[PDB]
């Protein structure tokens, strides 16, 4: 029993973290087979950042412009290329700790584990969701760029995020492992602001199922709702509209608990309109939106506490 924000074991990713230095900038990179991946702004200086031209800044670098350090060992760079907002540095050595892996572009509302790293050395692991506004609420200090996000299924690591920067509201922005930003952000020091965010409705519902599976029914009611009527309530409380595809996704959790999705939606609508106040769900005072339906099935018993 119990329910915790839970990260994936991090060892397969730890074995891939290196340090990349260009001039006076040092940050982390990811070493798979014979390539190291890192944020391209490693080639910039501070005044370069206001209005960088990477194609122009990069043509000015050689292979020996980049120092790659794996633990105590220096990796010699033997080629480099830009891919969108990352560099791919070819090194003379294949990482013998390369796990089975894929590069995935994660969708908003999905979760992943972040291994926060400094100077190529892992410092901690936590879980976070891709917000609908394409930011994450991470924990990052200077030198964390190049830290990665990932999910694991079986013994395959799906890398989905590489860290680049922090926005004025204290939230974080970065790219997939093809160097493409999540959201409308660019890698330069210019005014950029996270768009307005919303609550991930699908996740809130999944976590209410979590609560029922773990044995709590207090917030249920005898009502049902149409999808459309729920959505008028959703819009007023700044929740993402619920779709039939989201309803479908909740099928297996619905079946495990015998509670119809639209019945749980009515329950949610009641919680938004009347509050919880005083009461907790899974130890929480508020409605939680950072667990996916998949995160619930992963962690909960496949047997309901009836």
């Amino acid at each position: 029993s119990g329910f915790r924000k839970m990260a994936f074991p991090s060892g397969k990713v730890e074995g891939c973290m290196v340090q990349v230095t260009c001039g006076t900038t040092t940050l982390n990179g990811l070493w798979l087979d014979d390539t190291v991946y890192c944020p391209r702004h490693v080639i910039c200086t501070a005044e370069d950042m206001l209005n960088p031209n990477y194609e122009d800044l990069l043509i000015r670098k050689s292979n020996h412009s980049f120092l790659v350090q794996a633990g105590n060992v220096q990796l010699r760079v033997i080629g480099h290329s830009m891919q969108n907002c990352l560099l791919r540095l070819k090194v003379d050595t294949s990482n013998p700790k390369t796990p089975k892996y894929k590069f995935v572009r994660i969708q908003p509302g999905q979760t992943f584990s972040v291994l926060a790293c400094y100077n190529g050395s892992p410092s901690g692991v936590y879980q976070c969701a891709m917000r609908p506004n394409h930011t994450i609420k991470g924990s990052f200090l200077n030198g964390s760029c190049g830290s990665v996000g990932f999910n694991i299924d079986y013994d395959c690591v799906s890398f989905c995020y590489m860290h680049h920067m922090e926005l004025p509201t204290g939230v974080h922005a970065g790219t997939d492992l093809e160097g493409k930003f999540y959201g409308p952000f660019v890698d330069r020091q210019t005014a950029q602001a996270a768009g307005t965010d919303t609550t991930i409705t699908l996740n809130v519902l999944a976590w209410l199922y979590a609560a029922v599976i773990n044995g709590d029914r207090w917030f249920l009611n005898r009502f049902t709702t149409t999808l459309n009527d729920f959505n008028l309530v959703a819009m007023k409380y700044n929740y993402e509209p619920l779709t039939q595809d989201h309803v479908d996704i909740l099928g297996p959790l619905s079946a495990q608990t015998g509670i119809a999705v639209l019945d749980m939606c009515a329950a949610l609508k009641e919680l938004l309109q009347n509050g919880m106040n005083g009461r907790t769900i899974l130890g929480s005072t508020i409605l939680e939106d950072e667990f996916t339906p998949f995160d619930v099935v992963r962690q909960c018993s496949g047997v309901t506490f009836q």
Binding site: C44, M49, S144, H164, L167
Partner: peptide, 4 residues
């Protein structure tokens, strides 16, 4: 923005 803050690059990290």
């Amino acid at each position: 923005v803050t690059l990290x």
